[PDB]
Design an enzyme around this catalytic site. Structure first.
Site, short mmCIF file in Angstrom:
data_model
loop_
_atom_site.label_atom_id
_atom_site.label_comp_id
_atom_site.label_asym_id
_atom_site.label_seq_id
_atom_site.Cartn_x
_atom_site.Cartn_y
_atom_site.Cartn_z
CB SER A 1 -0.53 -1.44 5.56
OG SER A 1 -1.66 -2.01 4.93
CD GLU B 1 10.63 3.34 -2.59
OE1 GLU B 1 9.59 4.03 -2.48
OE2 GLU B 1 11.07 2.93 -3.69
N1 LIG Z 1 3.85 1.23 2.74
C1 LIG Z 1 4.92 2.16 3.06
O1 LIG Z 1 5.02 2.59 4.16
C2 LIG Z 1 5.92 2.59 2.00
C3 LIG Z 1 7.16 2.97 2.37
C4 LIG Z 1 8.06 3.37 1.43
C5 LIG Z 1 7.70 3.37 0.09
N2 LIG Z 1 6.46 2.98 -0.28
C6 LIG Z 1 5.56 2.59 0.66
#
Ligand SMILES: NC(=O)c1cccnc1
Ligand SMILES: OC[C@H]1O[C@H](O[C@H]2[C@H](O)[C@@H](O)[C@@H](O)O[C@@H]2CO)[C@H](O)[C@@H](O)[C@@H]1O
Lengths: 794, 138
Positions: free
Chosen positions: A464, A637
């Site tokens: 993030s 995921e």
């Molecule tokens: N924010 C992320 O790193 C992430 C990881 C996997 C799927 N979507 C987002």
């Protein structure tokens, strides 16, 4: 460890161990078997320690309250007295040594505390606790005191704690309720407060222990003490003319001593169980054996009917039994030990001033009732309920599940039951079974690789550009963030989950291994946790887009383009199940590793790239190469319901966060760090307008005093991707999301409502943009504030 | 103490190299880790002490040992009731917060507040734990 052919006996030092030794010497004279009697300190703690290792005495003596714990730990042999022997002892005494229906010791004698008083100092002992302060005051005129007794062992203070309503464990539904403890109720507080007040008023001293109280009473320094029958022998040796009588009442209620049955258990590890039975039944629990022990230190009301018939004529024994009848036989449940420890601490702390009575007894209550277990039950249940809400949202709002045979009806009540979670399990079950059926005859290399995957731990990575942690990492689901939707988000409806990439963890390389998920770098702050979540679910791809892209999109493209061949043209594909392209496999945390391994096996088996196959089937593949392969074949995921909140994480700063990325993530920390002067504010405001971050724009405008000349400067920012292409007024008006910024600019005179764009759509005004977007509110605002309608030639 | 699930002969078949209804001892832990079990090395070696190959009959009995029971609705209700000062069936948000913050395993304050908000289905600052616990049973 325990040696055969002799008997070692342990008994407390306050009991008649010399008389017991005489019984042992008679046993030896009859049998040739030596009996050794020892009295180690802290016997009731030392016995479970040494006995759990198969050592210790053959026979252990203690009050019966400790024995259920011993029996539960497997330290005691079941004893086997026949009808004739059992009939020699009082029935209630056998009940004291019964645990889970079995006899776990021989009862010896009934012990209860009495009030012992010096008849020469105190010819009429007090009937009430309440009159003891005034008696002490009278006696202090001659430097003597009314009462001294052991304040270090809660056994001696319990009769008073219990008088007005304190209790250990309530008996209900045919057993002691281990969750109904009466250590901090009103009666217990009143009794302990009375004791503490006696100490505060200098009628007793908090440091008084067994030896001090005994010495004081037996030297005539104090008029009264509280003790059991074992103490009488020493009083006999002293000069003192004493009586034994009913404990004083408190608040008009009898003191209620916890009554103990001195009992003899046989070590389960003993090779001498038959000799121990012979000794206990035919030498000790006889008139002659008990008489020898009793002549040493009185036993109290013995369990043997024939001897007790005479002992009960003794007024001291009658008084012992009268106090016992006002009290209660101690439970023998395993929870007694913790109970005693808790109450000991409370008494000692309250007596010392270290804690108030209320605080000491509150803490003792929580310890004795083991309320940590209940608090954990509550927490686990509520965590499971939150997870069920997330999974019901997904399975009942996700149209993809309706296209499959996997939908869930909306919850009947105001929240989902745990059925959603069960649904998850079954769903995972489905996708497990299917993939098993696809690869069931597994080869040696395939089985080895599946085992390697089963035994791998995972790092879960969430990136993030927001500031998601301080000492605590807090990640919120998309649904949770907005609550403080498009049809694409409706397709899966997993937007109440937190999303993670997945890496192999058993390595010493720098973390994270990977920074992109389906080619997206989600930001410079990589947050990594190293443990599974009980209610998470795993997909082999992004759940909504299950397409693996060509290799030149992959993060480590050169490794695979360098080292492999045909697999470069196979990996780009849809990852799905039998029901078609939208049949996304879903695995719970339990089934994750199996499903990943089996799908990897399937892909490798379908590969014509023999170099790739051999790379994967390398028996000694290191975890970094394994992660390379898994993150190549898949884009795993992992999803955690609702939120992640933890102090157990790593944060890795991958790079600087750019000003625009900070603006887009509403990262006020980065924004304040970067936007310190007017030119940076120019850039940051352009970035806020271009990304429709109206709140960020208004924050910036509150922190800096913008002018018309600032707008003119912003127009000259060719190094800003937005102002390079677009007029400020264009950016103010292109999307309605910037309305409140537009209003600000108009109301503070920073822009001309009729300024003709000089860049894209040159010659237009903000009204043109407003009309294009069909933004009625912006259209009306512009016109109310003097916008020109229409376009003439110059 | 298990049925219908039949654990998974399926999973078992993945490690049955010869299809003789048996698997090797050295793989046992792995096969239990594929189904959500984490027995210690000591417990692994002690269950190997009983028998190297293990068959599906013995494999089922071993997983039944490690398999733990779900808390019952009655147990959940009693765990709630011990913190119910009034016995009415309600626990205030403040009381539940004190309990979950100061007793049992440490959680973050955010997780505790989320649990309270989830349990307070009426938004009244009180949690009707009897209703909430009965509602969670399908
Ligand atoms: N924010 C992320 O790193 C992430 C990881 C996997 C799927 N979507 C987002
Ligand atoms: O003080 C807690 C303690 O009380 C009882 O111990 C008594 C014992 O019953 C008597 O035989 C005598 O020896 O005095 C002891 C108190 O010092 C419980 O039996 C014991 O388990 C508990 O820890």
């Amino acid at each position: 460890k325990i040696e055969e052919g002799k008997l070692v006996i342990w008994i407390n030092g306050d009991k008649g161990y010399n008389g017991l030794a005489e019984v042992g010497k008679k046993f030896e004279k009859d049998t040739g078997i030596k009996v050794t009697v020892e009295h180690p300190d802290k016997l009731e703690e030392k016995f479970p320690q040494v006995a759990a290792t198969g050592d210790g005495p053959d026979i252990i003596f203690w009050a019966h309250d400790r024995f259920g714990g011993y029996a539960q730990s497997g330290l005691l042999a079941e004893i086997t007295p026949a009808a004739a022997f059992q009939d020699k002892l009082y029935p209630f005494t056998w009940d004291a040594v019964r645990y889970n229906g079995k006899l776990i010791a021989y009862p010896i004698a009934v012990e209860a505390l009495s009030l012992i008083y010096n008849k020469d100092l105190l010819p009429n002992p007090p009937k009430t606790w309440e009159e003891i302060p005034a008696l002490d005051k009278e006696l202090k005129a001659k430097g003597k005191s009314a009462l001294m007794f052991n304040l270090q062992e809660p056994y001696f203070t319990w009769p008073l704690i219990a008088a007005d309503g304190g209790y250990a464990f309530k008996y209900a539904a045919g057993k002691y309720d281990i969750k109904d403890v009466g250590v901090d109720n009103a009666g217990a507080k009143a009794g302990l407060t009375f004791l503490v007040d006696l100490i505060k008023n200098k009628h007793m001293n908090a440091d008084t222990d067994y030896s001090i109280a005994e010495a004081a009473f037996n030297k005539g320094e104090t008029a009264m003490t509280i003790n059991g029958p074992w103490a009488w022998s020493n009083i006999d040796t002293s000069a003192v003319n004493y009586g034994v009588t009913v404990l004083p009442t408190f608040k008009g209620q009898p003191s209620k001593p916890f009554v103990g049955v001195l009992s003899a258990g046989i070590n389960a590890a003993s090779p001498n169980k038959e000799l121990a039975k012979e000794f206990l039944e035919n030498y000790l629990l006889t008139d002659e054996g008990l008489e020898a022990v009793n002549k040493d230190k009185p036993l109290g009301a013995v369990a043997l009917k024939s001897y007790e018939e005479e002992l009960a004529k003794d007024p001291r024994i009658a008084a012992t039994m009268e106090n016992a009848q006002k009290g209660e036989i101690m439970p023998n449940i395993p929870q007694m030990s913790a109970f005693w420890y808790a109450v000991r601490t409370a008494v000692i702390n309250a007596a010392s001033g270290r804690q108030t009575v209320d605080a000491a007894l509150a803490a003792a209550q929580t310890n004795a009732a083991a309320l940590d277990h209940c608090a954990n039950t509550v927490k686990n249940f509520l965590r499971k309920s939150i997870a069920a809400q997330s999974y019901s949202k997904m399975f009942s709002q996700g149209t993809s599940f309706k296209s499959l045979n996997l939908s869930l009806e909306a919850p009947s009540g105001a929240r989902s039951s745990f059925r959603s979670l069960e649904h998850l399990d079954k769903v995972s079950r489905h996708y497990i079974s299917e993939i098993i059926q696809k690869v069931h005859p597994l080869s040696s290399d395939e089985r080895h690789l599946l085992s390697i995957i089963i035994n791998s731990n995972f790092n879960f990575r969430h990136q993030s550009n927001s500031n998601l942690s301080n000492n605590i990492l807090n990640i919120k689901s998309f649904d949770k963030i907005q609550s403080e939707y498009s049809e694409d988000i409706k397709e899966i409806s997993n937007h109440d989950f937190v999303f993670f990439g997945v890496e192999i963890s058993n390595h010493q390389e720098k973390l994270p291994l990977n920074k992109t998920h389906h080619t997206v770098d989600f930001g410079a702050n990589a947050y990594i946790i190293d443990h599974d979540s009980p209610y998470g679910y795993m997909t082999l791809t992004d759940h909504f887009d299950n397409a693996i892209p060509p290799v030149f999109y992959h993060e480590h493209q050169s490794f695979f383009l360098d080292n492999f061949k045909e697999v470069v043209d196979e990996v780009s594909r849809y990852v799905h199940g039998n029901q078609g392209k939208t049949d996304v496999p879903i695995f719970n945390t339990k089934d994750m590793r199996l499903g990943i391994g089996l799908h990897l096996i399937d892909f490798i088996r379908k590969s014509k790239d023999q170099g790739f196959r051999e790379f994967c089937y390398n028996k000694n593949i290191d975890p970094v190469s394994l992660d390379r392969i898994i993150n190549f074949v898949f884009q795993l995921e992992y999803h955690i319901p609702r939120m992640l909140s933890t102090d157990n994480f790593k944060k890795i700063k991958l790079r600087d966060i750019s000003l625009e990325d900070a603006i887009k993530a509403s990262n006020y920390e980065e924004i304040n760090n970067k936007v310190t002067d007017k030119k940076m504010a120019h850039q940051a405001l352009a970035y806020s307008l271009g990304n429709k971050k109206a709140d960020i724009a208004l924050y910036l405008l509150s922190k800096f005093n913008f002018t018309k000349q600032d707008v003119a400067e912003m127009e000259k920012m060719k190094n800003n991707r937005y102002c390079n292409l677009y007029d400020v007024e264009y950016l103010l008006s292109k999307d309605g999301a910037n309305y409140k910024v537009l209003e600000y600019f108009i109301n503070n005179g920073l822009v001309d409502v009729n300024k003709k764009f000089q860049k894209v759509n040159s010659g237009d005004t903000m009204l043109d943009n407003a009309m294009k977007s069909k933004d009625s509110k912006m259209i009306d605002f512009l016109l109310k504030n003097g916008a020109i309608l229409g376009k003439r030639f110059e | 103490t298990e049925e219908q699930i039949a654990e998974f002969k399926e999973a078992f078949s993945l490690f049955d190299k010869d299809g003789d209804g048996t698997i090797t001892t050295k793989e046992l832990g792995t096969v239990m880790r594929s189904l959500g079990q984490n027995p210690t090395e000591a417990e692994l070696q002690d269950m190997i002490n009983e028998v190297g190959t293990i068959d599906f009959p013995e494999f089922l009995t071993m997983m039944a040992r490690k398999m733990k029971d779900t808390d019952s609705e009655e147990e959940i209700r009693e765990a709630f009731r011990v913190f119910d000062k009034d016995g009415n069936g309600y626990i205030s948000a403040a009381e539940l917060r004190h309990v979950m913050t100061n007793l049992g395993e440490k959680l973050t304050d955010e997780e505790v507040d989320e649990m309270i908000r989830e349990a307070d289905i009426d938004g009244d600052g009180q949690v009707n734990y009897e209703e909430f616990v009965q509602m969670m049973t399908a």
